[PDB]
Amino acid sequence: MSELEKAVVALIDVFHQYSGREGDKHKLKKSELKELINNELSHFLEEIKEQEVVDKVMETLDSDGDGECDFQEFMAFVAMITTACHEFFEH
Amino acid sequence: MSELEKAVVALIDVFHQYSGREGDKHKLKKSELKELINNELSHFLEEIKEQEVVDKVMETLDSDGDGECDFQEFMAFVAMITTACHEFFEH
Ligand SMILES: c1c[nH]c(-c2ccc(OCCCCCCCOc3ccc(-c4ncc[nH]4)cc3)cc2)n1
Ligand SMILES: c1c[nH]c(-c2ccc(OCCCCCCCOc3ccc(-c4ncc[nH]4)cc3)cc2)n1
Ligand SMILES: [Ca+2]
Ligand SMILES: [Ca+2]
Ligand SMILES: [Ca+2]
Ligand SMILES: [Ca+2]
Fold first, then answer.
1. The domain spanning residue B49 has which CATH number?
2. Would you give the DSSP letter of residue B53?
3. How many domains would you assign to chain A?
4. What range(s) does the EF-hand domain occupy (chains A, B)?
5. At what angle do helices A51-61 and A30-40 cross, to 10 degrees?
6. Could you tell me which residues come within 8 angstroms of residue A67 by beta carbon, excluding any fewer than 6 positions away?
7. Which chain B residues contact residue A84 at CB under 8 A?
8. Taking the C-alpha atoms of A47, A67, B3 and B8 in order, what is their torsion angle to the nearest 10 degrees?
9. In chain A, what residues touch B5 (CB-CB under 8 Å)?
10. Alpha carbons within 13 A on the beta-carbon side of A5
């Protein structure tokens, strides 16, 4: 498999490593999202230590108002993070 | 770096491995997009052998009508491919 194909699989793998822990196995609730960010994005994003901070991230990511981040919404999060990285985190 | 962080970097790396070959160094023209798909997505997508086929992919991906796929548009392509893979390529 190419690096791109492996990367695609990694995105799926990390989502399901967190989404399945609690409640709906197909969505990240705020507690799962906090864990994913703190454990898997520690070199790109600041550690989340306050509930208000993860509340704000979920508010941004949750486009259908169910209070959770589904796979489609996670893809949008990935695009945000990747765009930030692409621009050398300048913004 | 986590697998997710490495995956993010891989997405950026593969874009620039193709976008820089011709013309605008920041965008994939159809010829570059064809190369990327045939070389880096050979286990996920059918090989492109006809100009009409890459014309159609670019028509789908090109949201600002410049005839090329920029980084934002590439992210949308990645989301499409990843969603397809996530659903076991059933559709
Ligand atoms: C304020 C809040 N957070 C911050 C902040 C957080 C983190 C940080 O830095 C994080 C560590 C970086 C490690 C990854 C290295 C590779 O990433 C690439 C690879 C290719 C391109 C690229 N782009 C175009 C061509 N190549 C661009 C980036 C900087 C600021 N500041
Ligand atoms: C018609 C046109 N093209 C086709 C077609 C093309 C290619 C193909 O298969 C391609 C090869 C697959 C190799 C990658 C293995 C891992 O990918 C994963 C990993 C996790 C999940 C997942 N999802 C949820 C939980 N885990 C889902 C998928 C099948 C049909 N048919
Ligand atoms: Ca869950
Ligand atoms: Ca949602
Ligand atoms: Ca180019
Ligand atoms: Ca375009």
1. 1.10.238.10
2. H
3. 1
4. 13-48, 49-84
5. 100
6. A29, A30, A58
7. none
8. -90
9. 40-41, 43-44
10. 12
User: Which three-class secondary structure state does DSSP give residue B70?
Assistant: coil
- Yes or no: say if A30 and A55 are a contact pair by the CB < 8 Å rule: yes
B33 backbone dihedrals φ, ψ, rounded to 5°: -60, -40
Q: Say which ligand is closest to the CA of B12.
A: 1
Structure token pair of residue B23: 């013309």
Please tell me if residue A63 touches chain B, with a CB cutoff of 8 Å.
no
- Which residues are B28's β-sheet partners? B69
- In this structure, chain B runs to a length of 91
Query: Considering only CA atoms, which residue is closest to atom 31 of ligand 1?
Result: A89
3-class DSSP assignment, residue A28: strand
Task: Look up residue B78 and give its two tokens.
Answer: 């990645």
- Give the chain B residue whose CA is nearest to the CA of A79: B75
d(CA B17, CA B21): 8
Q: Which of B6, B14, B71 sits opposite A4 (nearest CB)?
A: B14
